């Protein structure tokens, strides 16, 4: 009975990321005065199926890897931490109701970089190793800023429970008292998933270029699942919906619409700006984002004390 719940959680994730590839192509194309795929299916609805069947019957590369264990294990960890990370999400009721769901998601965010590191190490090309090192550094820096922003927002919330965020946002959204934290959180989640304008491996090498068509597809599925879930996390954290305990479908429809709009905003940001340099995004974090994060952390530590606005523990 519970395995039915697990399957109905994990199979729509794969369907959603395939049609997210389709939606990305269509929305990106319509924003630059052309169309997306509309030939393969009716309005291109059969495009992800054709792409999947094409990618699963292509000849594997078989690179001359130094180690085969890390080469196998990097997609394993990537897909596992992409799919495990969806379970404490309160939509409006979570699959696993946990006391420290935010800390759980932050722990898997910190743990997800080993796929990049092992993919960079397993490839025999040292240029791929350099690219993997740069991607790892970017991910851990924005992990730091994600942790501080999450700490301040939860200090407004008062507990690490993810379902309590619906209760604390019943009157007004948290984007109204925490819009600088909202903006910086959105940019940090953009830079976490190697999303434009923070991707580097596409510009002048990639860490996962040596993988076959299948493992590259699995890395793509993991990355796009991370993108969708991060948008859902931003929706739950800052733009919470009205929840009726007798009609959960109202909350489901509302936050689904909001997270769809946020994912469309991700694709919209992808097609508007040039790429950052590596040192420029390091400058953006360590010299611009971090001082404001520390200042707003002090402000949100002191603000409930001076306003008699301390939230309950339970």
């Amino acid at each position: 009975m519970f395995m039915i719940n697990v399957l109905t959680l994990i199979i729509p994730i794969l369907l959603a990321v395939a049609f997210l590839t389709l939606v990305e192509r269509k929305v990106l194309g319509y924003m630059q005065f052309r169309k997306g795929p509309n030939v393969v299916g009716p309005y291109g609805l059969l495009q992800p199926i054709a792409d999947a069947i094409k990618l699963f019957i292509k000849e594997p590369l078989r690179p001359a890897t130094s180690s085969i264990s890390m080469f196998i294990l990097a997609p394993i960890l990537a897909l596992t931490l992409a799919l495990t990370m969806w379970i404490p999400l309160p939509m409006p009721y979570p699959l696993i109701n946990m006391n420290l769901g935010v800390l759980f998601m932050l722990a898997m965010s910190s743990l997800a970089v080993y796929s990049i590191l092992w993919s960079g190490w397993a490839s025999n090309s040292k240029y791929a190793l350099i690219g993997a090192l740069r991607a790892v550094a970017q991910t851990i820096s924005y992990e730091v800023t994600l942790a501080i922003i999450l700490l301040s927002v939860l200090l407004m919330n008062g507990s690490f429970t993810l379902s309590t965020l619906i209760i604390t946002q019943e009157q007004v959204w948290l984007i109204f008292p925490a819009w600088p934290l909202a903006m910086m959180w959105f940019i940090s989640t953009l830079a976490e998933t190697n999303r434009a304008p923070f991707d580097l491996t596409e510009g002048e090498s990639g860490f996962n270029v040596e993988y076959a068509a299948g493992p590259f597809a699995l890395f793509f599925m993991a990355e796009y699942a991370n993108i969708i879930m991060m948008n859902i996390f931003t929706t739950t954290l800052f733009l919470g919906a009205f929840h009726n305990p007798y009609m959960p479908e109202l909350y489901t429809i509302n936050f689904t619409i909001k997270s769809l709009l946020l994912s469309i905003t991700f694709l919209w940001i992808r097609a508007s700006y040039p790429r950052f340099r590596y040192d420029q995004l390091m400058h953006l974090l360590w010299k611009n984002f971090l001082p404001l994060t520390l200042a707003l952390c002090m402000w949100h530590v002191s603000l409930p004390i001076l306003l008699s606005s301390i939230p309950p523990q339970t």
Partner: protein, 169 residues
């Protein structure tokens, strides 16, 4: 066999230590340490330490072992009998302890160890409307003023020391 779950987890824990006590390679040693850290987080999860288990996942694995493997990737350039030998030896002694303490239920090496499950020594009470370990950590600012002061000064001094000694001039 379910009631020995923590004990079962503990086996994998010490098994993971023989993964890196033999020292095959820094990447494989890091992988063994990652497995051992996850198993230890599960062990402390089964005792009620949820915040400390997520401290293990967030700070040990995702914070420090990431830097360890990141520095490993800048050394031990990519391309034994002793590694497999001590791995087999350690596994054999470990299963000898397992078999003996599952046979006669009371062994000793340095201290007397009991062969029952971990569930016996648990508490029968309820903590109420709070987690005791959560408020124990939360008392870091209310009670541990001196500890906070010395830890913060240590971290600041560590930052100064780290950026000083790698200048080379």
């Amino acid at each position: 066999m379910m009631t020995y779950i923590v004990f079962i987890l503990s086996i994998i824990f010490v098994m993971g230590f023989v993964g890196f006590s033999s020292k095959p390679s820094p990447i494989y040693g890091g992988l063994g340490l990652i497995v051992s850290g996850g198993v230890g987080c599960g062990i402390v999860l089964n005792f009620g330490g949820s915040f400390l288990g997520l401290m293990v996942f967030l700070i040990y694995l995702g914070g420090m072992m990431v830097v360890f493997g990141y520095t490993t990737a800048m050394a031990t350039e990519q391309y034994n009998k002793v590694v497999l030998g001590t791995f087999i030896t350690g596994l054999l002694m470990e299963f000898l302890m397992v078999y003996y303490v599952l046979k006669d239920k009371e062994v000793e090496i340095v201290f007397k160890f009991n062969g029952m499950g971990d569930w016996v020594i648990y508490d029968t009470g309820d903590s109420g409307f709070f987690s005791e370990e959560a408020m124990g950590i939360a008392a870091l600012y209310s009670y541990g003023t001196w500890l906070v002061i010395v830890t913060g000064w240590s971290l600041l001094i560590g930052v100064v020391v780290i950026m000083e000694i790698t200048r080379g001039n």
